[PDB]
Write a protein that binds this ligand. Structure first.
Ligand SMILES: [Zn+2]
Ligand SMILES: [Zn+2]
Length: 66
């Protein structure tokens, strides 16, 4: 189960703060230029880091009878 309400307000690249952006499902924080690829502007929605994109599992289709 665990819990992850309050996200981390500290970077994990240069250990610097200020204009930090924490991933949706990942409390981890990063800087615009630090991110790869770096973001030009702050997105207004659900942003996903590399970890999230790499956390994609093969979508299988159950019930394959007949
Ligand atoms: Zn950084
Ligand atoms: Zn993430």
């Amino acid at each position: 189960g665990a819990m992850a309400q309050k996200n981390e307000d500290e970077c994990a690249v240069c250990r610097d703060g200020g204009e930090l952006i924490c991933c949706d499902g990942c409390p981890r924080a990063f800087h615009l230029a630090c991110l790869s690829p770096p973001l030009r502007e702050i997105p207004s929605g659900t942003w996903r880091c590399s970890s999230c994109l790499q956390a994609t599992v093969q979508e299988v289709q159950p019930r394959a009878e007949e």
